[PDB]
C-alpha cells in the first residue's frame, strides 16, 4: 500500500541514489547482501514502500537506474550496496551523453526511453496501490536534464493522478561545472513547470558552506555532501514509513505547499547539524531544532530567504517529542519574523510528527520551505541564458540535432512568465 517507484538519472543521480539506498537500508536494517538483520518489528511493518519481497526473505529496492554511458553503472554495482539492486534495472546505453541537452532529450533519448518504460510499467503493475514516483537528477548535465525530463513527459501521459517529485541539483552561482549549463537548465525548467507536482531545488554551493561553516570538515568529499541530501529525501516520506502522532505523506505536503500550479519550486533544510568536537557543548533539545532551520546558513539552495517571502512552510519532526513545544516554537518564529512571511495566507506553517529518529540521533526535523527568494535563482539563469543566446554561441551543437530558435525562445519566455509571478505575489496584498 502506497508504494514509491524510485527513478535515477545521470552521473549525479546515481551517486545520490547509491548513497540514498545506503541510508534507507540502515533505517530498516538491511545488509549489503539483501537479507534482514533487524532487532525490532516496526522496521518490517511498512517495508513494501521501497522494497519488494523476493524469494527467501530477501528485499530488493524498487529502483530504476538510467544512464547513457556504462561508466557510472560500472562503479555502482561494484561498490557497497551494489549487490542489492536487481540487474535487470541497470538500463544503460553504449553511445554516451556528450554533456548536451539535444543528445539527451532528442537523439539518444528516444532510442532508450522505449526500453526504460518497459521497466517502469513492470514495476508499476507489481505494486498494490501506487502512491507516486520520485526522480533524482541534475540540471547541469545531459542525461539528468535531457533524458531526465523526457521520462517525466512520458510518465505524466500514462499516470496523470500520481504525484511526481524531483530532487534536482540546480547549478551554483559562482563556480560552474558545465560551460553550457545555462542552456541545459533553461531547457529543463521549461519541462518541469508543466510535468511535475513539486520540485526540490538544491545548490552545490550551499552544501560546501555547511560542511565548512557548520559541520567543520577538513576534506568533504561527495560522500559527505550527498549524505545530507539523502537524509532529506528520507525525511519527507518518514511519516509514511513509520507511525506517528500527526501523520503526513507525499500528498499532504503537495497540497499544503503548492497554492498555484506553477509555483512548486522549494528549498530543503535539515536539522540538527552539529560539529565533531562541538556536539557535547550544544543543548540538543526541541527549540535547538527550530533556531537551526530558519537561519540562512542552513538552506540547501544558494539564495538568501530574507530577500523574499515564505508562502508555505512545512516542518516534519521526528522522534518522541511533545506537541505543545512544537506549536510554541512554530508560532513565535511567525510573530517576530512577521514581515518575512506572506499576508494573504494566514497560519502558513505545516506540522507533521513521526516517532522514530534516524540511526544515531535522538530527535530530528526536516524543513520543506517554499519562498519567493528563488526568484533570484531564475533571474541568474535567465541572465546567463540571454547573455549567451544573443551571440548565438554554442548553438550549432543544438541546432545540428534537429532544433530551432522557437524551442529556445518559448523556453526563455516561459521562465520570464515564472519570474513575473514570484515578483507579483511578493508585493501583493
Amino acid at each position: 500500500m502506497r508504494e514509491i517507484v524510485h527513478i535515477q538519472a545521470g552521473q549525479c543521480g546515481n551517486q545520490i541514489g547509491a548513497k540514498f539506498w545506503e541510508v534507507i537500508s540502515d533505517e530498516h536494517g538491511i545488509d549489503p547482501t539483501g537479507s534482514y538483520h533487524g532487532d525490532s518489528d516496526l522496521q518490517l511493518e511498512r517495508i513494501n514502500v521501497y522494497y519488494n519481497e523476493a524469494a527467501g526473505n530477501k528485499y530488493v529496492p524498487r529502483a530504476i537506474l538510467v544512464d547513457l554511458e556504462p561508466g557510472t553503472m560500472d562503479s555502482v554495482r561494484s561498490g557497497p550496496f551494489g549487490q542489492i539492486f536487481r540487474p535487470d534495472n541497470f538500463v544503460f546505453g553504449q553511445s554516451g551523453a556528450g554533456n548536451n541537452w539535444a543528445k539527451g532529450h532528442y537523439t539518444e533519448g528516444a532510442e532508450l526511453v522505449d526500453s526504460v518504460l518497459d521497466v517502469v510499467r513492470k514495476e508499476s503493475e507489481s505494486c498494490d496501490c501506487l502512491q507516486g514516483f520520485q526522480l533524482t537528477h541534475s540540471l547541469g548535465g545531459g542525461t539528468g536534464s535531457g533524458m531526465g525530463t523526457l521520462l517525466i513527459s512520458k510518465i505524466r501521459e500514462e499516470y496523470p493522478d500520481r504525484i511526481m517529485n524531483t530532487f534536482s541539483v540546480v547549478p551554483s552561482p559562482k563556480v560552474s561545472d558545465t560551460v553550457v549549463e545555462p542552456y541545459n537548465a533553461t531547457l529543463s525548467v521549461h519541462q518541469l513547470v508543466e510535468n511535475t507536482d513539486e520540485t526540490y531545488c538544491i545548490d552545490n554551493e550551499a552544501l560546501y558552506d555547511i560542511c565548512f561553516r557548520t559541520l567543520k570538515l577538513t576534506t568533504p568529499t561527495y560522500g559527505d555532501l550527498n549524505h545530507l541530501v539523502s537524509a532529506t529525501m528520507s525525511g519527507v516520506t518518514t511519516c509514511l514509513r513509520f507511525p506517528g502522532q500527526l501523520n503526513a505523506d507525499l500528498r499532504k505536503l503537495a497540497v499544503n505547499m503548492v497554492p498555484f500550479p506553477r509555483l512548486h519550486f522549494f528549498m530543503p533544510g535539515f536539522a540538527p547539524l552539529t560539529s565533531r568536537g562541538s556536539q557535547q557543548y550544544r543543548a540538543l533539545t526541541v527549540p535547538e531544532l527550530t533556531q537551526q532551520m530558519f537561519d540562512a546558513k542552513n538552506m540547501m539552495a544558494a539564495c538568501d530567504p530574507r530577500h523574499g517571502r515564505y508562502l508555505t512552510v512545512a516542518a516534519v519532526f521526528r522522534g518522541r517529542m511533545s506537541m505543545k513545544e512544537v506549536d510554541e516554537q512554530m508560532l513565535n518564529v511567525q510573530n517576530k519574523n512577521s514581515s518575512y512571511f506572506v499576508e494573504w495566507i494566514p497560519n502558513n506553517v505545516k506540522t507533521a510528527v513521526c516517532d522514530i529518529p534516524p540511526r544515531g540521533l535522538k530527535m530530528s526535523a526536516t524543513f520543506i520551505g517554499n519562498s519567493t527568494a528563488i526568484q533570484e535563482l531564475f533571474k541568474r539563469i535567465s541572465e546567463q541564458f540571454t547573455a549567451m543566446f544573443r551571440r548565438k554561441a554554442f548553438l550549432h551543437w543544438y541546432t545540428g540535432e534537429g532544433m530551432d530558435e522557437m524551442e529556445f525562445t518559448e523556453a526563455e519566455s516561459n521562465m520570464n512568465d515564472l519570474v513575473s509571478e514570484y515578483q507579483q505575489y511578493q508585493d501583493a496584498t
Binding site: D177, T178, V179, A393
Partner: protein, 432 residues
C-alpha cells in the same frame, strides 16, 4: 566499455607515441611483452591468451623511425600489421603528403582502422597525433581527416598537433605546410589541441633546472598531458569527463577549435620538497603566463572557455575555492558573453612516475585545456610569413610539379584571413 583508438602520424607522431605507450603500460603494470602479473579495456584488447595489445595505428612514410619500434624494447607489444610504413618520405612537402605518396597507402590504413573499429562497441572517438611542420604529419593527416569524416562522421575526432614555434623553426617551408594543412582540417577536425616546442624548452630550463633537454625529455611532458585527458576513461573519478564532452564545452563556434594545453606542477625532485602543493597553489600555476606551453601571452586576449582536469588526492570543496579566486583577479579576464567559463573534472588516481625521468612523485596534478583568443596573434604572424615567401613565389616549383593547382595557395590564404577576422568578431563587446 568506452573504447578509443589513437593514430600516430609522422616522426613527431611516433616519438610521442613511444613515450605515451610507455606511460600507459606503467599505469596498469603491463610488461613490455604485453603480459601482466577491467578498467584498462579502453586502450587495450585482451586476447584469448593473457596478452594485451594497444589500439594504436602507427603510420609514417619513411621506414627510419618505425624500425626503432620493430627492433627496440617495445617490440612484442604491437601487432605487426599495424606498423604501416612506406618506401620514401614526403620530405617537407604538403603535395607529396596529399597527392603523390599519400594516395598510395591511404587505402591500406583505412583497412586497418576498420579492423579495429569493428571489435569495439563503445567507440567514442579518435586521437590523431601529428605535426604541422613535416610533409607526412601535415599532408598525410589532411588526407586522413577527409577519409574519416566520410566513413565515420559522428565520432569526436581530437588532434594533438605540434604548432610551429615563433622563433625556432627547423624546416624552412613551415609557413607553407601549416596553412595548407589548416585549410583542410578546419572542416573536419572537432578540437585540435596546440602544443609548442619552444615553450617546453622554457619550462625545462626554468622549472626543472635541466640545461640540455633532448626530444625524449620533451615527449615525457607531452605524454603527461595525453594521460590526464584520457585519465577519466581508464579509472573511476568523483566527477568524470569523456572525449565527447571536450568538443561541446570548448568549441563555441565551428571555426574556432584551437585551444592550448597547460600542465602543472612541473618541478624537479630536489624542489619537490620545501612546498606543499595544494590545489589552491597549483591551479594558479596554470593561469600564470610563464607556465603555458604555447608561446602566446594570454593577457593580450581573452579566455573563451577553460577546462581544468584535476587528478590525485583532490578535495572537491577546495577546487571550488581555487577557481573562485581566479575570477576575482584582474589580469585574467573572460569574454563578455561567457559568464560560466569552466569545465571541471576530478579523478582519483595520482600521476605515476616513469623511471629515469625528471619529474617527482607528487600527490596531485592539474591539466588545463584553455581556449583563448590570444592565439589570434599567433595566426597573424604565420600569415605574415606566408605572404612574404609567396610574394616572391619562392619554393612554389616543388609544389606545382607534385600535382597541385597553383591557385590553391590563393584559395588557402583567403580562407585563413577569414579565420583571422573571426577572432575580431568574438573579441568585441555588445550594446546594452
Amino acid at each position: 566499455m568506452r573504447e578509443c583508438i589513437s593514430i600516430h602520424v609522422g616522426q613527431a607522431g611516433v616519438q610521442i607515441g613511444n613515450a605515451c605507450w610507455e606511460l600507459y603500460c606503467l599505469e596498469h603494470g603491463i610488461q613490455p611483452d604485453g603480459q601482466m602479473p577491467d578498467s584498462f579495456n579502453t586502450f587495450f584488447s585482451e586476447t584469448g591468451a593473457g596478452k594485451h595489445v594497444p589500439r594504436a595505428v602507427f603510420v609514417d612514410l619513411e621506414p627510419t623511425v618505425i624500425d626503432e619500434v620493430r627492433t627496440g624494447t617495445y617490440r612484442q607489444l604491437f601487432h605487426p600489421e599495424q606498423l604501416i610504413t612506406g618506401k620514401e618520405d614526403a620530405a617537407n612537402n604538403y603535395a607529396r603528403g596529399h597527392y603523390t605518396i599519400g594516395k598510395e597507402i591511404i587505402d591500406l590504413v583505412l583497412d586497418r582502422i576498420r579492423k579495429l573499429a569493428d571489435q569495439c562497441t563503445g567507440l567514442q572517438g579518435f586521437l590523431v597525433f601529428h605535426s604541422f611542420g613535416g610533409g607526412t604529419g601535415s599532408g598525410f593527416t589532411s588526407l586522413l581527416m577527409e577519409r574519416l569524416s566520410v566513413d565515420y562522421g559522428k565520432k569526436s575526432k581530437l588532434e594533438f598537433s605540434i604548432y610551429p614555434a615563433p622563433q625556432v623553426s627547423t624546416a624552412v617551408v613551415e609557413p607553407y605546410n601549416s596553412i595548407l594543412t589548416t585549410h583542410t582540417t578546419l572542416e573536419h577536425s572537432d578540437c585540435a589541441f596546440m602544443v609548442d616546442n619552444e615553450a617546453i624548452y622554457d619550462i625545462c630550463r626554468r622549472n626543472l633546472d635541466i640545461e640540455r633537454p633532448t626530444y625524449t625529455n620533451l615527449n615525457r611532458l607531452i605524454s603527461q598531458i595525453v594521460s590526464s585527458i584520457t585519465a577519466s576513461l581508464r579509472f573511476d573519478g568523483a566527477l568524470n569527463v569523456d572525449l565527447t564532452e571536450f568538443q561541446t564545452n570548448l568549441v563555441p563556434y565551428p571555426r574556432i577549435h584551437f585551444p592550448l594545453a597547460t600542465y602543472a606542477p612541473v618541478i624537479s625532485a630536489e624542489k619537490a620538497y620545501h612546498e606543499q602543493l595544494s590545489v589552491a597553489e597549483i591551479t594558479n600555476a596554470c593561469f600564470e603566463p610563464a607556465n603555458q606551453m604555447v608561446k602566446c601571452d594570454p593577457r593580450h586576449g581573452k579566455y573563451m572557455a577553460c577546462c581544468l582536469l584535476y587528478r590525485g588526492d583532490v578535495v572537491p570543496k577546495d577546487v571550488n575555492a581555487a577557481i573562485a579566486t581566479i575570477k576575482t583577479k584582474r589580469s585574467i579576464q573572460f569574454v563578455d558573453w561567457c559568464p560560466t567559463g569552466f569545465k571541471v573534472g576530478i579523478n582519483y588516481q595520482p600521476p605515476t612516475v616513469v623511471p629515469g625521468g625528471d619529474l617527482a612523485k607528487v600527490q596531485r596534478a592539474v591539466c588545463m585545456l584553455s581556449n583563448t583568443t590570444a592565439i589570434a596573434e599567433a595566426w597573424a604572424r604565420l600569415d605574415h610569413k606566408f605572404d612574404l615567401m609567396y610574394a616572391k613565389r619562392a619554393f612554389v616549383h616543388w609544389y606545382v610539379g607534385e600535382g597541385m593547382e597553383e591557385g590553391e595557395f590563393s584559395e588557402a590564404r583567403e580562407d585563413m584571413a577569414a579565420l583571422e577576422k573571426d577572432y575580431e568578431e568574438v573579441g568585441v563587446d555588445s550594446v546594452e
